[PDB]
Design a protein around this ligand. Structure first.
Ligand SMILES: Oc1nc2ccc(-c3c(Cl)cccc3OC(F)(F)F)cc2[nH]1
Ligand SMILES: CCCCCCCCCCCCCCCC(=O)O
Lengths: 414, 185, 405, 414, 405, 185
């Protein structure tokens, strides 16, 4: 029995250094999806394994001038390695020189967006259809109208000492009733008071129709918002920015892409400023978090899902997968270990083992959980959050009324 | 009651006259950015804008109200708004009416036999309010154009009280004229 | 040489010119296009061939022989199968598969969520039940507060007249009386302000309800499909999909299998056409579980009545097959990739599913439209009316008999 | 001086047989754009011409098996012709064997649609937001409510012989005022009448809000209609059908087209049923006229404009030109007449002569005229045509009121 | 061999890598791409060359020599000019042009029609002046008819109270009195019905005015540009466009030339950049007349502030040029067509104008948005209010002085 | 007046009773197309549809009201509408109430001393209208589904008059009870 080398890589969550690895030793020093996969593979095939990280710390690439393979591929070709359990994207250049098993995880490019917030409507949001200046000028105009009505109804002794009921208090009451399209017990009988009432009525009509119409526009527009659901939506629109990781093969896929959509996205990508691209995927994540929904990163599906279940869960995978690829297990050319490895990967795939491990390391360790994530009421009916301020106003007015009733009782009694 | 109702009227007119003249000639109305600064903070007014930070600080310059544009002498409504806004005649008219009304009230403590003097003052105090609330709609509608953020100062609210006080003393002056007439009939 | 294949749209479907044109041009499909580039890369000659027996491939539990298309390759009847054959353990032991040229998974099929028949009491839809419930308590609260104010601190405004004043204020109608005190007037104003917002809010949101159609699917996943019980779901009576739920140990898919066998009537069907019709006839009460490719193809064919919802429950793929010990094995393994990075397979995917698509490929083909409100829309408020009148006469006779006594 | 052959073709309006050609003879037998062009060309070059129609009656084509040129091209190559003034689209095959002048008219493929009608809103269109059944049930419910109110207010002697003012007539008045959100001089005092009034008020509120909201939806939807303005709009949408002439080179342009848009249109074209294509351009014209805006023909710009100024002008050219081509004058290879012809065509082009002739034969002979055709108010403000029925109702009600006043006077007097 | 050219975007513009890369790759543009396929068809070698002198070509009225790019070809300094050279009589006599590879015409340039500053009395916009005018006559008509009915056939309803009843009915406010006769009640009902439609119509259409932005250009042609006088229009001081209007004998373009010379201030400019800015600054009061290609290019460049409106006033084209007696003459004449039918020139047209387009190439890039109503929107009804109050006090004193007498 | 007011009441009830029973049992309500014909023209009704042209002409078949669908016994509101629409209890109830009311009126010409008999008849005539107008909302709301064209016949309008007449005789019967009571008090 000869132990076989594995040559993982420390990318998250495929392999992780444990919480306190200093006291631990051997293969128990590590954990991850790939580690449990290697355990299952060793169990099925019937060998014993000793894990390892590549010193270089990379997956694989052909040095053009040196004509050398780096990373795990190099460790496989040059006899330093017998297996490679880490995520190795299946490519033409890699498959030429080493043998890949059938894929244990299929994936592709996907869109990552800042998660829409709860969007709490806020108290006193029913005032939004009209500006603050309009409301305050309404108040001041109401005062002016009431005073003018009181004047032109209680200035003439010829109808005063005899008469009009339009004092200041009843005038304010009349104006307030008029503004709300509610009649009052009185109405002007003179020409002056009637002119005042009519023009105030016109003002009221225009203002209320404006409020209702603008509110309808608000709710209609907020209802027709179509969230991004695909790449063609990003291609057609240009308001929201989007970029990739320039170091990786994502830009290698976009520069070469021949479909009209992805060609359009590529033309947008390099033309824009200051930099839609970002040096590191963590930087793209935190940029999308900071951009306030104005930037959409493009990323492998697996890391998008992983980030979607790590605090702060202010991110979301959206749409399907633009392409289709597969991570796979690699072995050197002509190795006796190819067949058992491939058959064991498939046997696990028909069983729920790979799905179980994925659900374990992406969702069961979800810091923010799932709870059927992304679900919503999906109802446009107005809610008590929208119109809470007017209920609060009603309660305050009733309390003030009771207080003033107490004061009136005290004043009248003594 | 008790006959000090006239004292409140003339006290209100004198204060309401100051709170309007001081409001006009104080230029702490608006708080916004206009690119004159180097835009940068301002504490503008009816006549002169004035930067607040940067190298230009404590230096106040007249507001134009007529930057070179085709709308000058072309748009009938827009030009007329800009004529009245530049002149600020409506706020200036409001302080005049309060002044005349206060004089009539003070000229009614003497010549105490007459009553129609007070009716004039009550109307002027009321007409001051209409000019005032016209003088603020013009100012607000003029400032707008076409997500910038602005704020209103404390000279703005000084003009607001002059509306409230003026409308109050219009009520009291009328109530005086009512009370005086009944004593005479 | 011998390209064994089976006929299933869009992979292979007989061309309209089946008779006058013979051989390679006789057949057409996604696989038919593909074998050209495979042979272009390799160079080998090929002739279109159909498997005589419609089965894909499997070993009998007793005879232990391979039927269908794979049985051709095991026994040397052919040398390649450019066809939709799933990669599986039992098939890998005996023949050598390629790498996956199209990834796959089980999916969900539903009827398109149509504009539902409008229900009675649909006029309440613009405002949630929380608002309607809290309107009533405020109506009670205001009428009570007007009574206490008017009795404890009078200048009639009893309880019965206060409930009338508040109601007439809510409907913008003319109050027979008005408060004459300050405390009664403060209550009226805030109630008056309260109504003005609420009536406009109802009228405003309703204009959105009618101007814009926004239909949301009942489900977006399989968790939502197992928890509920109103909607049904089934698979073919004989297929891997039934097997996948049978052997599954995940809690959600084990939960489904309890439902599927405990079916009254049977959820299962004999062929995919039965499941398509059952979805097209159940009016959103059936959800057919199948592969992600038929669902995508069917979604783009007429009558354009269904959609694929949710993600994929399983991951699997189709792979080109060659016999054990074929010189063709490594080129095809190296060719499908060369197409895959190049993006050829994506273009064919668009060609046979989305392009040449009868449904327009997007909602932009459809346009908004309006309809005059019908009696069904507002029949709930006629019933409420006629119900109130019968109550009014009923209450009056009670007053009559009481007043007589 | 040797007279030169011209070999026109009778396509409209380039050459037309005169209204009564039997008495006329020679070149005066014909008229058209091409005839006046040939007159100007002869004047500039300094020769004398004798017009002719091709016996075959076609422009030009290569017989594949026979390897023969047909039509005007054949008459030019085989010495039967010295000039060709007719519209000959410049092509590669034609230019190989004969010499083309510079183009005297540039054109391309364009979209032809049924002209939108005036769309008279119609009297009694303000009732459209609510169905006929709703209005009539409102009437019948108003009657029922009035009768029930009259009953429960005038059934009890304990309040009758003493009382309530709610007779049948005042009850109808109260219900009518309630439905219109206008108060009346009376209001119920009993519990029964108050229940009736409240529920009728609720009915009124719901119905009026429904009317206003549905009307707003109607006007908003009718405002967001985007008419077709390009080919990409037809490519994206599929509600409106569109096709070409199958005989001609338009389908030759579409079958071969490699741009994504026109490829999409070509895929739609042959797939559809029963036949988007049409045998003859007149058939396509009258089909689009009959289709009621549901079919869009694709046609050369010139014939589209020509049809747009012939009665019945129920057609319109829409959008720009999909491609760019040019009609041109042809001469046989090596002819001495090439240079003067080309220079004269250009000299006319810098002058306004060709534009003048086009305006003459397309617009000045416009049966339906132009009047700056296609102009509109482009205002969404409601017009008196929309709400004429309610004014008519008002007038009828006033007349009925005066008539009933006369009847009341006659009844009261005697 | 010697491909004479001039630099003008997108036909030829210096590449960013002007220094490190030299020769053919130094330059780029629409013409740069084109010369590759011309030389691919012909096969001849070519080197990118720029005309030393910026003029295109013309003959001095005294010296009679050809300047600029054409002067290179006449005097044998080069053999081809793949460049944007218009086909014209004076240029054809001395050199042999190709067929047109891009058709052309004079066009119109305007600022994009922006959301205008809202005017006072904009609240009347939902209803045309015909409706407002006919509302008043009906208000007069109803009030009169109520007076005649109530006096001739009484059971107060004078003229002054009838005008009050009708006004209070139009505003949904509580009438102090109600008719008590049948004839007076028939008048009230139809007036009440009339208002209910009108108020809802105002409120409904306003919701469309705010929900949807629909901006229509002031003009769509040149007829609409000559009739009016509010908007101005100009051309370059030295160019064919001024000449074209000068020699034109058509009535419409002769009408323009009267305006253009009688310009106060001058409509003309010294360069196209001046005309672009004047359009970008006049706020829709200037309309620059230029060629259809710069307008199409500028329309697709930032800040994306302008558009090309209307058709084309003239027809002309750009053509490849060769000297008199060049063996290259017939291939290029046969190559541009070969590109034209195949559709290459369309693809380059899309490449350099629409694709690589900063403005999104369609209105779909923009999205609808709302704004809370500001005092400027509804300042007209505050002025009407405060105007009415001053009238009311004024009328009262007139009553006072009259009543005193 | 003149005491023939009772004759109009009982005449109206008997006619309003016929115009409703005839309306129910006549099946010329609707005019539409339903694909039973071979869709083709029909003159449908409350119970039985009946083709009008084609090979199937003059042959009338019962309407189902329960085609095989999942909504059967599943949708609470839809099923209940279909129960009442199938039974047509509300129109059938309306004719019963008119019959009882007419009997009470005819039983009030005799027993002429009593007055509360007439009040019952007036209420029944009124309650007939509410059942009637309920019986048509159900019928209309049931016919709708999900641009076809329909039309309403003359048995429909026969039910309409029974509403108008029933509401009229409810007014007269009440007016009789009012007039009778005043004579007794
Ligand atoms: O000269 C001046 N007159 C005025 C009248 C009112 C106000 C005002 C106040 Cl006091 C509070 C809040 C907003 C205000 O401005 C408004 F117009 F109402 F929007 C300011 C004024 N200044
Ligand atoms: C009753 C006093 C007169 C007031 C009523 C005015 C009636 C105006 C009705 C005009 C309707 C207009 C119909 C033609 C449509 C149009 O103008 O284009």
């Amino acid at each position: 029995n000869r132990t076989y080398i594995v040559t993982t890589i420390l990318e998250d969550p495929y392999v992780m250094l444990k919480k306190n690895a200093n006291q631990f030793e051997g293969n128990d020093r590590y954990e991850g999806y790939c580690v449990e996969l290697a355990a299952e593979i060793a169990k099925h095939v019937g060998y014993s394994y000793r894990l390892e990280i590549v010193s270089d710390g990379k997956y694989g690439a052909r040095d053009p001038d040196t004509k050398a393979w780096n990373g795990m591929v190099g460790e496989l070709v040059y006899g330093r390695a017998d297996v490679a359990v880490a995520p190795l994207t299946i490519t033409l250049v890699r498959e030429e020189v080493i043998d890949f098993s059938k894929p244990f995880m299929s994936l592709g490019i996907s869109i990552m967006i800042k998660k829409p917030q709860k969007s709490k409507p806020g108290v006193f949001s029913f005032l939004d259809p009209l500006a603050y200046e309009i409301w305050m000028c309404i108040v001041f105009a109401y005062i002016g109208v009431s005073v003018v009505l009181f004047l032109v109804s209680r200035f003439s002794p010829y109808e005063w000492h005899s008469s009009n009921e339009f004092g200041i208090f009843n005038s304010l009451w009349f104006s307030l009733g008029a503004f709300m399209q509610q009649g009052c017990d009185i109405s002007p009988r003179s020409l002056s008071g009637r002119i005042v009432g009519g023009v105030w009525w016109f003002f009221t009509l225009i203002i209320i129709s404006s409020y209702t119409a603008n509110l309808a526009a608000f709710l209609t527009v907020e209802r027709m918002v179509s969230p991004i659901e695909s790449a063609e939506d990003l291609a057609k629109q240009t308001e929201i920015a989007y970029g990739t990781l320039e170091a990786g093969s994502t830009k290698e896929f976009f520069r070469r892409s021949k479909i009209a959509v992805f060609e359009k996205m590529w033309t947008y990508m390099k033309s824009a400023e200051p930099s839609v691209f970002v040096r590191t995927t963590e930087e793209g994540m935190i940029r999308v978090r900071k951009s306030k929904g104005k930037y959409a990163y493009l990323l492998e599906s697996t890391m998008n899902e992983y980030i979607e279940q790590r605090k702060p869960c202010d991110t979301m995978k959206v749409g399907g997968n633009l392409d289709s690829k597969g991570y796979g297990i690699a072995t050197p050319k002509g190795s006796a270990l190819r067949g058992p490895v491939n058959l064991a990967v498939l046997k696990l795939s028909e069983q729920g083992v790979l799905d179980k491990l994925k659900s374990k390391w992406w969702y069961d360790k979800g810091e923010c959980g799932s709870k059927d994530s992304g679900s919503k009421d999906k109802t446009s009916a107005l809610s008590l959050s929208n119109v809470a301020g007017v209920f609060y106003i009603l309660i305050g007015g009733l309390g003030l009324a009771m207080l003033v009733a107490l004061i009136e009782f005290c004043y009248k009694s003594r | 009651e008790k006959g000090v109702q006239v004292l409140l009227t003339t006290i209100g007119a004198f204060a309401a006259f100051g709170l309007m003249t001081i409001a006009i000639s104080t230029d702490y109305w608006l708080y916004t950015r206009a690119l004159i600064c180097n835009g940068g903070l301002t504490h503008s007014g009816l006549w002169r804008i004035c930067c607040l930070e940067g190298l230009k600080r404590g230096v106040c310059v007249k507001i134009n109200h007529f930057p070179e544009d085709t709308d000058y002498d072309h748009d009938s409504a827009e030009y007329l708004l800009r004529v009245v806004r530049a002149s600020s005649i409506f706020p200036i008219l409001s302080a005049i009416l309060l002044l005349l009304g206060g004089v009539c009230v003070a000229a009614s403590r003497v010549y105490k036999s007459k009553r129609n003097i007070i009716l004039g003052a009550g109307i002027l105090f009321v007409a001051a309010g209409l000019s005032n609330i016209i003088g603020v709609i013009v100012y607000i509608s003029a400032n707008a154009g076409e997500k910038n953020h602005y704020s209103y100062g404390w000279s703005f609210y000084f003009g607001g009280l002059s509306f409230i006080l003026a409308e109050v003393i219009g009520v009291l002056a009328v109530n005086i004229y009512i009370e005086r007439s009944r004593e005479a009939h | 040489v011998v390209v064994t294949t089976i006929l299933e749209s869009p992979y292979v479907m007989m061309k309209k010119n089946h008779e006058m044109l013979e051989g390679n041009e006789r057949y057409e499909g996604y696989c038919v296009d593909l074998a050209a580039e495979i042979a272009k890369h390799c160079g080998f000659k090929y002739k279109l061939t159909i498997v005589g027996d419609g089965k894909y491939g499997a070993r009998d539990a007793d005879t232990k022989i391979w039927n269908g298309m794979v049985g051709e390759l095991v026994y040397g009847k052919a040398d390649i199968a450019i066809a939709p054959l799933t990669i599986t353990l039992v098939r890998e032991e005996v023949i050598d598969f390629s790498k996956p040229f199209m990834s796959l998974g089980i999916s969900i099929m539903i009827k398109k969520p149509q504009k539902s028949k409008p229900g009675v009491f649909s006029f309440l839809d613009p405002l949630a039940y929380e608002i309607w419930m809290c309107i009533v308590f405020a109506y009670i609260g205001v009428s009570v507060v007007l009574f206490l104010v008017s009795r404890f601190s009078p200048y009639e405004f009893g309880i019965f007249n206060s409930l009338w004043f508040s109601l007439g204020a809510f409907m913008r109608q003319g109050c027979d009386i008005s408060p004459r005190s300050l405390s009664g007037r403060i209550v009226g104003g805030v109630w008056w302000f309260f109504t003005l917002i609420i009536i406009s809010s109802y009228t405003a949101n309703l204009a959105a309800f009618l101007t814009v159609e926004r239909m949301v699917s009942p489900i977006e996943s399989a968790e939502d499909l197992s928890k509920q019980t109103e909607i049904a779901y089934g698979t073919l009576d004989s297929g891997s999909t039934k097997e996948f739920f049978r052997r599954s140990k995940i809690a959600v898919f084990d939960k489904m299998w309890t439902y599927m066998r405990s079916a009254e009537p049977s959820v299962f069907v004999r062929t995919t056409a039965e499941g398509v019709a059952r979805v097209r006839k159940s009016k959103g009460k059936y959800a057919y579980l199948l592969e992600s490719t038929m669902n995508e193809y069917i979604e783009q064919r007429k009558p354009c009545d269904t959609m694929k919802v949710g993600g994929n429950l399983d991951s699997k793929g189709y792979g080109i097959a060659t016999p054990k010990g074929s010189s063709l094995g490594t080129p095809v393994n190296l060719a499908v990739l060369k197409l895959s990075e190049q993006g050829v397979l994506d273009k064919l995917k668009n060609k046979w599913w989305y392009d040449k698509g009868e449904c327009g490929a997007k909602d932009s083909g459809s346009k908004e439209k309006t309809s005059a409100l019908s009696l069904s829309n507002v029949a709930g408020v006629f019933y409420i009316l006629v119900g109130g009148l019968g109550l009014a006469m009923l209450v009056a006779l009670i007053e009559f008999c009481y007043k007589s006594r």
